[PDB]
Paper text:
Vps4, a member of the type-I or meiotic clade of AAA family of proteins (ATPase associated with various activities)11 disassembles ESCRT-III polymers from membranes, which might be coupled to the membrane fission reaction itself. Here we characterized the oligomeric state of the Vps4 homologue from M. sedula (MsVps4) that belongs to the phylum Crenarchaeota.
The structure of MsVps4ΔMIT was solved by molecular replacement and single-wavelength anomalous diffraction (SAD) techniques, and the model was refined to a resolution of 3.6 Å. The asymmetric unit of the P212121 space group contained one hexameric ring structure composed of the typical large ATPase domain and the small ATPase domain with its C-terminal helix packed against the large domain of the neighbouring protomer. The 13 amino acid linker sequence plus 6 N-terminal residues that form a short β-strand (β′) in mammalian VPS4A and B are disordered in all protomers. Three different protomer–protomer interfaces were identified between molecules A–B, B–C and C–D (interface D–E is the same as A–B; E–F corresponds to B–C and F–A to C–D), which are generated by a 10° and 15° rotation of the large ATPase domains in the different dimers. Each protomer–protomer interface can be split into two interacting surfaces, the conserved hydrophobic (H) interface between the small ATPase domain and the large ATPase domain from the neighbouring protomer, and the variable (V) interface between two large ATPase domains from neighbouring protomers. The V interface is dominated by polar interactions that vary substantially between the three different interprotomer interfaces. Superpositioning of the hexamer on itself by stepwise 60° rotations reveals the extensive conformational space that the pseudohexamer can adopt via its V and H interface in the absence of nucleotide. The nucleotide-binding cleft is open and accessible to nucleotides in all protomers of the apo structure.
Numbering used by the authors:
A (entry chain E): 96 to 168, 174 to 208, 214 to 367
B (entry chain D): 97 to 369
C (entry chain F): 96 to 369
D (entry chain C): 96 to 367
E (entry chain A): 97 to 170, 175 to 369
F (entry chain B): 98 to 168, 173 to 208, 214 to 233, 238 to 367
């Protein structure tokens, strides 16, 4: 159960994902010059690229063949099977199957490179338009597109920068991660959102979790029945110590690669 | 898809004719011979691949297409087996029927790297290939076969490699008149709506490669399909001129102003022609 | 045999260990955003990161599956994978219906990132198999319960993927004055000490020494006295004096170099995570 | 080659080749401290080092065992040793009782120092086997006679052991004005030239071009004229004019970059 | 070749006794135990190898000698065996065995397969020393490591050698008994007065004393055969004088400051 | 014999010291004597000819091997080279001398260690008696601190002094008709800094000067050689040993005597 509720906002990113995949599914005839089956989600880590890609499969009541490139690194037997089954699972029932690759970086001594990598690279040239069949997509996810190699890179024509979340994005996160921790007024999430400039969505969950943990520590070593109501100065003290997980230089390194490989 | 000019780039075109179509039609006229190695270098997207296809079809000729990426990664140590075969078959397919065959190499840059592990990836496969071109010259006549190499990164290209391509044609970023016929060809079948006047777009798109024209129209048409969805409807909206306007604020030329100066440098200093 | 009543490290280290592991054990419902199963003990060596982790198992009447990363790399063969899956296997299994949480302890966590032969079975094969196991602890059809305490003196070695399957990281700091005292007591244990010694003023003289090189300082002070009995030719050893500690404390310095102290302190601030 | 052709390269190149090889052939007794059998032709590319070395064999009615170092590395995976010994084998053999000295010529000498697969067999195995062969040419009073002319555009690659089995090193320099003239003649050969062309002032206009990119300049000037006939639709080509050379000489520059020129010049002075 | 002060250097010696001869003679007296790893570090030539032999023979003990060079190039199989046999050779007969490692530095480099070089063989060995501690008693076996380059020595390696003895460049009184021991059998001639040599040889290692006398004696044999006698002449003061102009100390003044630094920051005890 | 190289005494007496004495009179060396001997210096000084001189001083066998050549096994040969040298040192106590040209060249699993430690071991073995190993190198940088300690005797074959050069200039004048006015002495001192190798070159190239003449002049006989021949050939030809290699040797020399 994870439709387009969904991630919290992010529209820009989202409509560009629709554009790539939801439309040619709904109406292929409208794309005479075709449309690319390879799609790349690149950005700082924690922004939960894995959850976004799940959202599009469920938008299309579609199968979501998830694989972590770590594990899959023969091993040729598996890489052909992952496509195999996705095409197969795209039955006469034109339900498009979505293959999702976590840590795409990790696909990059004779058998390590090439053997398993070109076998996979080839598979994507195949998705194009061999006697129609059609349907199957590949969403690759990476926090390190530096690793990504100029051949690899051209079997992913659609590349969407999952950006670090803006102030308005954070707010609805801070809401969604407040969800069920009894919050106490005086907290005013809005001023947090803006205090949390530069944090990924991952290390927001952390912030709240560690703030709420603050309160549970009290109940135990105070010996209260119930936790304390979670205060604003909880966030303040936890926000001194916890910093953004994405370093200012990684931020300039992404920004560079982004403009040179749109 | 013959040499009607894929699109009115004349300058480029006549220099390609010069290199290949003439010696085919009339070799006796070239007593000092003529070079079989020919290099298409410039910013990417200008579709060097389509141009080279045009010359084969100008000569009712075979077009042996190969991406240098694959020939490096995709085999093993003995990716030598394939590089000799590519020439093999092109000569063979240049039968008694003096139909000249054209080998086209996408990403020529890629023969100079991509070895990963086992030893060099250099020399073994590269000199085998470099040798093959010395062979095209004039070994017991036979003749006929050409090599069109394509690259967006002639920096990579190495001063030995370079000299088995004596004919070098800068495929330049397309001029206003070129663009127009592209904008036409990529409008082809997207219901366009009057008020659009392609001419003033062609001139608005100064500095874009031919690749990121297809993008601009595709993304403008995508604008109209986005509307149809959740409003519903089976035809989309009629594609407007302010579509192009808003899409043209966000989408910029894919070829960076510094790459433009880097090509221009290498063009003047390495490339006589 | 050694529960987490514990002697001193409250302020920081111990309560931060409780926080991580003892609470979610006693009361999981109180953590709706869950809680991390991977927990990292990083600091200068000698502070006995191994004895601390034992303390939390015995706090939870819990099993303590101890493994040295050295052995799991060198020992076995190519299929040292067989062992790494078994270590988790048995810990889950031994976390029976009896919701007693099992605690895997990894000495020298650094050592999973090198020490092989067939370049390619060395890395990845065994390392990702292990890295994967920890993603598994999270929340696969509940089961729950099992933890991983990794210990290291060299978190520089530690690698940014590895690092993120240990979300709880506790700097086991060089021991404070109050800590030392109860060590100096525990290592005096049975060496006839002689009054005039007053351990308190030692504890404060031994600012900057690890717990390891306290045992050394007393052992070498007591050795001072045995040297006497022999080359003096006395029948008992001498009673161990205070000026023993003084002259042994000139020569023996802290084992943790002032630069390794700045190197920890750096890594600490750039990879904090409570 | 028939007096060893007076192509022009007198002071410097040719006499220095004669010096090395033609004299000890004609009159060994005159060299009591012996004379080196390894001889290196190093310079910018295109100057046709391969044609020069042919000239010396034909000066001595001598055999010219030509081998490209590329091929000898590539073929016969590991046992490309079999060929390298055979090349010398045959050259000594072909230097029969008939004291005709044989000349081995090695194109791209640089290429013996790379281009392999198995770490251990690439270097050493084939390279020392070859290096050893040259120590053999010295004397062991078995045969004498055989020489090795190595050719390279990249003597940087050349390695300080390799280097010392070539004691005679001749910089084949970019061709002088007088040299060019007889090239411009030889490459005019059969392209109907038209008076008004006066090759002499071209030779001096083409200062800094290698011999290779002179063939290019004329070929591309003649191509100028054929382009006319076609798009003009004339029945013959046009007669090749002087302003052809002029407009082709704006665009075509020397193929040897001014920095390569300083890099050779450096290596030249540090390894005479 | 026991000790007793067979070489005449005490400070070093009593600190070696302290470490090893006492716990052998009377373990009960050490309740906090005693370290089995012991490190001999200093300038080269001072013959660390002969010193360590002396303690084995002090204890009628076995002396398992191994050069770390060989164990690297010429390997896990052997490193376990070296300990294996030393424990085994420490039979019910509580005769403590002593493993001696020449060039301890050499366990930290070598190799061929980067990764079997480090760790594989090094940690196997490092583990072995944690084992000597007190696994179900057994006890007895020691490890004397020798090095001229403790810079190489690595802060983990270092801490399985808790006893570290700086074998210092030999003092004037030490040298004398060397000059005696290396005159041993070269017919010396009066006029020579070894005492004033000992003090002339300030700053030389014990190694380059053997050299100085050998090369002085060589002076006299060269005469024989440049002059043509059947035995040597010969042997005299002024030989030493001329040979002492040319031959200098083998231990450079900067190595001297580098040891001295590493010694202070930080030697144990 | 010891004619021999021409006259380098210093070097020579230090070679005698190492090898000729313990051969004639071992009893005089109670602390033994080293069997491994290293000849290190700039190239061309003909280390190979010097080592031949000591074998012939001892009417001794001279097992010559280039480390280039001896580099899948190759272990078979390295054991055989010692084998035969010990064997050839028969009951007849004639000491055999193994000479290794380019010792540097002994330094993927089989390349290092396999053949190298097999060889390193052989020298620990020499410690029967009789057999020696003279290793030669122009690049003792390559030489490795284990290798290096199985060669306890190390003699810097220095760039040849003025008196040395003279008898070379004589020996390489040997048979080229020289012409008075030449006065070799002032050449020897003009040739400060040249190796013995690039003396042979100097004369050979000076004599070649004269043969040039005969040919392009068309004389019957060469011209007589000269003095200003040497002068012009000495402008162009410089020492083959670079001033930096000179400082690099000098460094290694003092740090590894």
């Amino acid at each position: 159960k994870v439709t387009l509720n969904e991630i919290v906002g992010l529209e820009d990113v989202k409509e560009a994902l629709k554009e790539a995949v939801v439309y040619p599914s709904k109406r292929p005839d409208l794309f005479p010059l075709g449309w690319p089956r390879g799609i790349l989600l690149y950005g700082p880590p924690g922004c939960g690229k894995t959850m976004i890609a799940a959202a599009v499969a469920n938008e299309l009541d579609s199968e979501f063949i998830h694989v972590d490139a770590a594990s899959i690194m023969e091993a040729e037997k598996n890489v052909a099977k992952i496509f195999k089954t996705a095409r197969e699972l795209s039955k006469k029932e034109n339900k498009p199957a979505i293959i999702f690759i976590d840590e795409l970086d990790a696909l990059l001594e004779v058998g390590g490179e090439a053997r398993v990598r070109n076998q996979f690279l080839k598979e994507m040239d195949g998705l194009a338009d061999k006697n129609e069949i059609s349907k199957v997509y590949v969403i690759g996810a990476t926090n390190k597109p530096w690793r990504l190699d100029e051949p690899f890179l051209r079997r992913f024509q659609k590349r969407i920068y999952i950006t670090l979340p803006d102030k308005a994005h954070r707010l609805e996160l801070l809401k969604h991660y407040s969800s069920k921790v009894k919050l106490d007024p005086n907290v005013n999430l809005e001023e947090l959102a803006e205090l949390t400039d530069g944090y990924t969505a991952s290390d927001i969950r952390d912030i709240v979790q560690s703030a709420h943990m603050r309160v549970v520590k009290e109940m135990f070593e105070k010996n209260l029945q119930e936790p304390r109501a979670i205060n604003m100065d909880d966030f303040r003290e936890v926000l001194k110590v916890r910093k953004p997980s994405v370093n200012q230089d990684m931020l300039k390194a992404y920004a560079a690669w982004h403009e040179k490989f749109k």
